[PDB]
Write a protein that binds this ligand. Structure first.
Ligand code: 1SY
Ligand code: ZN
Length: 352
């Protein structure tokens, strides 16, 4: 616990470092937003509220920034791609230029999006900005040869969430049934991430995204509406997620020689954390004075997800983030062994 608190104190020393870097991400995003609005296909574009800086810049890792551009779309009709539950074809009930039959081409939309951004990068003489894995819905920029920012186009749909979500967002015993109903009345988003079609991609498919809901449940995270609003109600939920993310970042650095861990992501840690919040719904199970135990709760559940090769998407229960289709068996066994060693030995990766 004292070691975990020291880690948390150490992480705070880079508070201003991440602050100023988020401002550089922020300013470039606003110039991008204006140019995109000039285009007929993207003039309803805007910034989605997903991050801790302003409202639109999310930190996924040190110097890895995440921004989502939402696009209000006329009423959409969805067609689930096969039985994948997260991936969908988009149909209608301006964007005409991206249709292939009746299906809105994710690859064609994302292609023009990528093109317009690339045009604004070449034009700007303010700073050094460049372009850049596979299968991502994001277009990632590099600012000042040091700051990385994923920019993701996101179709906004204001209709009821798709059926694959009906048993997801299992917050009823933690944040309440009332809140679940309120959250499910908000829009959902589709990003041009394509399902894998054999060896390539179904380049017309989109994936559901609930990044806005993820931010809301992290910031408004207690059973008590006044959780973390006073000294009597200080929980350690956010600190536990921070320590889980830092554990994964540190292991990925230590195992960088053979890149065994590069498929694992802060998104996996965040998803597992939300499941532990469901499992431990009472604020009394996250008392700040129990940080060590709460972190152990998070590590042991993550370990179980690795061993069983099952980490359910928090909104889409039948989408398994740890399926063999996405992460090979050998990599999940590898990470299990190292987290087991770390937990058995009081986390030597956090030493010094
Ligand atoms: N900025 C950004 N927003 C996204 O929505 C997203 N989805 C994928 N990626 C990246 O594309 C590549 C393919 O990963 P895959 O989709 O097969 O599994 C992904 C995806 O299923 C899931 N995931 C990540 N971000 C989200 C997200 N915002 N919403 C839902 N699922 C997500 O966690 C897995 C690993 O994510 P990352 O390894 O950190 O970056 C991935 C990866 O580089 C994303 N990058
Ligand atoms: Zn709290």
């Amino acid at each position: 616990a004292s070691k975990l608190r020291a880690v948390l104190e150490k992480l705070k020393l880079s508070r201003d470092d991440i602050s100023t870097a988020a401002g550089m991400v922020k300013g470039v995003v606003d110039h991008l937003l204006l140019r995109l609005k000039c285009d007929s296909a993207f003039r309803g574009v805007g910034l989605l509220n997903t991050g801790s800086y302003y409202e639109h810049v999310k930190i996924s890792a040190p110097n890895e920034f995440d921004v989502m551009f939402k696009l209000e779309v006329p009423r959409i009709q969805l067609e689930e791609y096969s039985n994948t539950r997260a991936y969908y074809f988009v149909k209608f009930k301006p964007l005409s230029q991206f249709l292939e039959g009746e299906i809105l081409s994710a690859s064609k939309m994302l292609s023009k999006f990528r093109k317009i951004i690339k045009e604004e990068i070449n034009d700007i003489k303010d700073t050094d900005v460049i372009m850049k894995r596979g299968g991502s819905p994001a277009v990632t920029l590099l600012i000042s040869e040091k700051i990385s920012v994923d920019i993701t186009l996101a179709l906004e749909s204001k209709s009821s969430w798709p059926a694959s979500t009906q048993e997801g967002l299992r917050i009823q015993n933690w944040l309440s049934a009332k809140v679940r109903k309120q959250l499910r009345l908000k829009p959902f988003y589709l990003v041009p991430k394509h399902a894998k079609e054999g060896n390539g991609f179904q380049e017309e498919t989109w994936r559901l995204s609930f990044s806005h809901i993820e931010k809301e449940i992290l910031n408004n995270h207690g059973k008590s509406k006044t959780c973390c609003e006073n000294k009597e109600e200080k929980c350690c939920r956010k600190d536990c997620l921070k320590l889980m993310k830092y554990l994964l970042e540190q292991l990925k650095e230590r195992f960088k020689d053979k890149k065994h861990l590069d498929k694992f992501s802060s998104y996996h840690v965040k998803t597992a954390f939300f499941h532990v919040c469901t499992q431990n719904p009472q604020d009394s199970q996250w008392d700040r004075k129990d940080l060590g135990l709460c972190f152990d709760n998070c590590v042991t559940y993550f370990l179980q997800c690795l061993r069983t090769e099952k980490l359910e998407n928090y909104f889409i229960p039948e989408f398994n983030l740890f399926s063999s289709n996405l992460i090979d068996k050998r990599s999940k066994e590898f990470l299990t062994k190292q987290i087991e060693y770390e937990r058995n030995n009081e986390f030597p990766v956090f030493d010094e």
